Structure 1
Amino acid sequence: KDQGNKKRQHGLEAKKSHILAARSVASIIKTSLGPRGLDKILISPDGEITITNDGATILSQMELDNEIAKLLVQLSKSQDDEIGDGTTGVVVLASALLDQALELIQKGIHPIKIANGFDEAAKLAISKLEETCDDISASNDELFRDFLLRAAKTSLGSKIVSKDHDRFAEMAVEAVINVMDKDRKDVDFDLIKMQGRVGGSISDSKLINGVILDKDFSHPQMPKCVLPKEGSDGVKLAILTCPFEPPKPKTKHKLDISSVEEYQKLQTYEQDKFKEMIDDVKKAGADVVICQWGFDDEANHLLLQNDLPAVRWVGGQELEHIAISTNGRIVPRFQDLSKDKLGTCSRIYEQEFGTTKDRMLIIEQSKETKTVTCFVRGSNKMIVDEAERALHDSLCVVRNLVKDSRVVYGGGAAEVTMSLAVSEEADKQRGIDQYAFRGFAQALDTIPMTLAENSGLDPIGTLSTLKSKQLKEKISNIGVDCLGYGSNDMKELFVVDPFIGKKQQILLATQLCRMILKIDNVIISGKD
């Protein structure tokens, strides 16, 4: 079926078209690469308006019919969960490998040889980069606190955060450590909640150790704060998976009212069930009741008399994060409540944020929890979304810094050291793979040349200068200047990149470059 409007490619054709398809998307993100790049205006189909240079956001919004560039979106989707800040770095590096792969094809080298050529060249560059790598925790402990603050400052320097960055730098460090273990080194993005609302400024943003739920405490007369009640155990909260209402059988569901007699009785029976369901909360000692469904008007009447605030319309996913952070349990029925199954937190209070009419709640905890909600304030909706994703980028950089204590010096010095080491070892490796190793070293030179063009420097002159400083003088890390400074040697500036982060970039770039070479044919069906 669908014979017409069917595209078919062959070996002698698609191999040239697959390279041109990658160079089109690559040249688009070369202008936004680096702190001197371009912030692009993007509007999601859901109505969110924001301006950012992040490649993971830009490439995700790209909808195109080129099948080679679709593989760039598939890799960035998997990389966004691992890192998310290396989208612009991998695509340009992968395109540099494809540009060198096309040259090897013209020399008579099969594309499967290029896949194995870059694979052995990537593994060789990992060992060379690890030998020149430096460690933090084994060196200086106080610089470890300074490295985490200044690494986020690099990502927060291109945003309005740069004025208040001092506070958000500490908020990004604590948010990552809370959701992870030092030995396990496992950080999940679902454990850190990123939220923000309009109003206030960025200097008023607070770091919360628990959920948010966006609740006003239902009826306004209910108290906006919850006390420990004379040295109790934490603050007990009730989690209910059943709505608040008189129970009805599943066999009938029908209620017959013959006259005012049965009408007045049924009206009192529904109120008697309201008194029986609230007593189970009092017997368990739960201060606030959290339910998935709304409450009636009579419900807020009995909860107000007993000073028991209410929570309405909580999603199923939010109920899981409450029991984990507060060390609670999920109680299916009403009568199964008890002090052991109630979530225990440090305190519960309603903190009014600026002039915003939301008036949400804040549930914190003294001990380390598995759930952290980062809340950001700003005078405009675009400012909130800009500072939110900028803080999220700082969470991803610190995530890789604590994942591997060893880090490499960035700013272009990492790609030059990896290129000079493979190029020297390329002559020692004979055979057909010798050109595959030389082309891999030339492909690594695209990253510092791209950063040099965006910084206003000669890409050839600066790259050749850095190679002479790392050879004739001594072996060290001196990169191109991304941000304004007096001179070279970013190592003096203490600009570091995570070794596990940079290694993850070169592996995904090689894994995708091989997969692109493993597709010589494109079959696209038409529209019936």
Structure 2
Amino acid sequence: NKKRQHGLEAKKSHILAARSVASIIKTSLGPRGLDKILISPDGEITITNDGATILSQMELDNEIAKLLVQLSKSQDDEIGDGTTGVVVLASALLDQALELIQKGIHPIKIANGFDEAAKLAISKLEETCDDISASNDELFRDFLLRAAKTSLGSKIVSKDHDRFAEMAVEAVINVMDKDRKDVDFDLIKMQGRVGGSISDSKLINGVILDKDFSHPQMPKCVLPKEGSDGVKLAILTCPFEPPKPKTKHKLDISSVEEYQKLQTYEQDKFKEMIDDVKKAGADVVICQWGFDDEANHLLLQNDLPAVRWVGGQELEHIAISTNGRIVPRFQDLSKDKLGTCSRIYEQEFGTTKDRMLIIEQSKETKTVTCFVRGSNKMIVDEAERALHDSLCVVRNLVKDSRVVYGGGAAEVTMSLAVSEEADKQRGIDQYAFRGFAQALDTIPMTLAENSGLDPIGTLSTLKSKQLKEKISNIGVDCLGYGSNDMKELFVVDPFIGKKQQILLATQLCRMILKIDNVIISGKD
């Protein structure tokens, strides 16, 4: 079960495979983009326009495509923005290469050209960069928001998405420190409840997890009581109560004395264990198993809410901000072995009776977990993806104040620059540098084709104004506004992101054009 094909004709097989990958992802590019139906292994129906999930759930058997996907993962992991453009641009770069192959251009002569042409394009893009953070700090916050809405207004939340941008820009403002000059995106957890509306999503200044207090007589809010070590959370596997197995018992009872004798044992272990909560230093107790009712009533006098059947990772997320520990026994617990917060309160959301638990530090917290609602279970999944992506939108805008005015205008601006350097080639490479422009044009072309605009005249419309007039942003009208000028529409992409799109795509040309054999061995 191996392949046999000799000559450059094998590269025609390889490129024709890439055209299949593109025919999938192509139609997903743009805010007017078309969705894909994803058949889950279990039959679950997922509908998304996100090329990261489209490529992740895309299953193809040609190993050339498996390379294209594995390499595109680096766009999602390092940057997290335009994985879609990596595949779309690469396909066009390979499509123009197919023409170069037939013209007799040696495979390496092709690769050397795309490398030097990228050195021209990225440089000419830098000549047009702009500083989104210029002037005042309040202007930074303003423009930071104006762009964040461009990523959120493209999803189902677009009706009132400004509210998801409210939590996003304010979150990264809380999570970003200009002295640190970096944003640890793991400091933000994405979590919501199934059902609700856009206005039911909240900006939460602290940790919220899918839990509620296990006993209604315990206080829904615990405070340090003016000066204590905040609110400590007990993270244990066993409850504070007389020991009772959760599998089998097998306690032989020989007489009535022995029968009720366990209740005597329970009374001392009831008060001992609930005193061991207070002595151990827990203000609330969360254990993998629940707590005895009589212990629960003895906990009441000390205001010791508790929660049952909770996994370690969920309490870990709290323990990250509170510096808690999973101590094997309650006897070695301390004010520090049990992590500390300032306030734990249980919040009800209108008709939502879930009443989730929120852990705050009564100050600027080291972590936030924002609250997401949406009218359909699957809307919530994508809505949190919008917060994930818009979190990376502002994360890159913090990383690099340099931005480009996008919408295909930067690609056409770079395309025109490549055509300017075409006349300066006057050599064999002139064949290849020109094709780089023909490939750069496929991004604004794809943007127009997914929008319902003229696939050819749109290219001449953008090139006309970006050539005869000025480098002023002349974008694609996919948003349905009046005309071009994304500076007026405040549609902006990160500079470092577009640089990575061009450079990573060039790497894909180095990877695909330099594979001459596909040897697929069997398995024993």
Q: Verify same fold: TM over 0.5.
A: yes
Which residue pairs with 2:383 in the alignment? 387
The more displaced of 219-228 and 46-55 is: 46-55
Alpha-carbon deviations, 1:387-443, whole Å to 9, x = none? 322333322222211121110001111101222223323443565444332222221
Report the TM-score, using the length of structure 2 for normalisation.
0.89
Shift in CA distance, 113/407, structure 1 to aligned 2, threshold 3 Å: same
User: Is this contact kept in 2: 1:280–1:337, CA < 8 A?
Assistant: no
Shift of 1:204: 1.5
Shift in CA distance, 275/80, structure 1 to aligned 2, threshold 3 Å: farther
What is the alpha-carbon distance in structure 2 between the residues aligned to residue 348 and residue 282 of structure 1?
17
Shift of 1:31: 1.9
Shift in CA distance, 226/250, structure 1 to aligned 2, threshold 3 Å: closer
User: Is this contact kept in 1: 2:30–2:447, CA < 8 A?
Assistant: yes
What is the alpha-carbon distance in structure 1 between the residues aligned to residue 70 and residue 240 of structure 2?
45
Shift of 1:500: 1.8
- Over the matched positions of the two proteins, sequence identity in percent amounts to 100
User: Is this contact kept in 2: 1:423–1:438, CA < 8 A?
Assistant: yes
Number of positions where the alignment pairs a residue of Structure 1 with one of Structure 2: 524
Shift in CA distance, 251/468, structure 1 to aligned 2, threshold 3 Å: closer
Shift of 1:49: 4.3
User: Is this contact kept in 2: 1:243–1:291, CA < 8 A?
Assistant: yes
User: Is this contact kept in 2: 1:478–1:490, CA < 8 A?
Assistant: yes
Which residue pairs with 1:287 in the alignment? 283
Shift in CA distance, 329/67, structure 1 to aligned 2, threshold 3 Å: same
Shift of 1:132: 0.8
Shift of 1:222: 1.9
Alpha-carbon deviations, 1:66-115, whole Å to 9, x = none? 22222232134333333443122111011111112222222333333433
Q: CA-atom RMSD, angstroms?
A: 3.3
Shift in CA distance, 78/293, structure 1 to aligned 2, threshold 3 Å: farther
Which residue pairs with 2:197 in the alignment? 201
User: Is this contact kept in 2: 1:208–1:374, CA < 8 A?
Assistant: yes
User: Is this contact kept in 1: 2:406–2:491, CA < 8 A?
Assistant: yes
Which residue pairs with 1:136 in the alignment? 132
Shift of 1:499: 0.9
What is the alpha-carbon distance in structure 2 between the residues aligned to residue 419 and residue 100 of structure 1?
14
Shift of 1:452: 1.8
Shift in CA distance, 293/522, structure 1 to aligned 2, threshold 3 Å: farther
Shift in CA distance, 256/116, structure 1 to aligned 2, threshold 3 Å: farther
User: Is this contact kept in 2: 1:208–1:363, CA < 8 A?
Assistant: no
Alpha-carbon deviations, 1:301-342, whole Å to 9, x = none? 433453311122333323332122234455454222222444
SS in 1 for 2:330: coil
Shift in CA distance, 253/430, structure 1 to aligned 2, threshold 3 Å: farther
What is the alpha-carbon distance in structure 1 between the residues aligned to residue 320 and residue 286 of structure 2?
15
Shift in CA distance, 45/369, structure 1 to aligned 2, threshold 3 Å: farther
User: Is this contact kept in 2: 1:42–1:50, CA < 8 A?
Assistant: yes
User: Is this contact kept in 1: 2:316–2:324, CA < 8 A?
Assistant: no
Alpha-carbon deviations, 1:466-489, whole Å to 9, x = none? 233223323332222221122222
Shift of 1:193: 1.8
User: Is this contact kept in 2: 1:41–1:51, CA < 8 A?
Assistant: yes
What is the alpha-carbon distance in structure 2 between the residues aligned to residue 277 and residue 500 of structure 1?
57
Match of 1:397 among 393, 396, 406: 393
User: Is this contact kept in 2: 1:49–1:382, CA < 8 A?
Assistant: no
Q: Which stretches in structure 2 are left out of the alignment for 5+ residues?
A: none
SS in 1 for 2:85: helix
Alpha-carbon deviations, 1:18-59, whole Å to 9, x = none? 111111121222222111111333353467544321111222
The more displaced of 233-242 and 18-27 is: 233-242
What is the alpha-carbon distance in structure 1 between the residues aligned to residue 197 and residue 465 of structure 2?
45
Shift in CA distance, 113/262, structure 1 to aligned 2, threshold 3 Å: farther
Q: Which stretches in structure 1 are left out of the alignment for 5+ residues?
A: none
User: Is this contact kept in 2: 1:42–1:51, CA < 8 A?
Assistant: yes
The more displaced of 236-245 and 106-115 is: 236-245
The more displaced of 30-39 and 296-305 is: 296-305
SS in 1 for 2:332: coil
Shift of 1:248: 11
Report the TM-score, using the length of structure 1 for normalisation.
0.88
Match of 2:302 among 286, 306, 322: 306
Which residue pairs with 1:69 in the alignment? 65
User: Is this contact kept in 1: 2:416–2:467, CA < 8 A?
Assistant: no
What is the alpha-carbon distance in structure 2 between the residues aligned to residue 251 and residue 162 of structure 1?
51
User: Is this contact kept in 2: 1:199–1:378, CA < 8 A?
Assistant: yes
What is the alpha-carbon distance in structure 1 between the residues aligned to residue 503 and residue 7 of structure 2?
26
Alpha-carbon deviations, 1:142-189, whole Å to 9, x = none? 332232222232223233322212211111112334444435454455
SS in 2 for 1:357: strand
What is the alpha-carbon distance in structure 1 between the residues aligned to residue 328 and residue 128 of structure 2?
57
User: Is this contact kept in 2: 1:212–1:361, CA < 8 A?
Assistant: yes
Alpha-carbon deviations, 1:354-408, whole Å to 9, x = none? 4344322122234333432222112332332343223333222222111211100
Shift of 1:522: 1.7
User: Is this contact kept in 2: 1:199–1:354, CA < 8 A?
Assistant: no
What is the alpha-carbon distance in structure 2 between the residues aligned to residue 43 and residue 221 of structure 1?
46
The more displaced of 125-134 and 518-527 is: 518-527
Matched, 1:173 2:169: yes
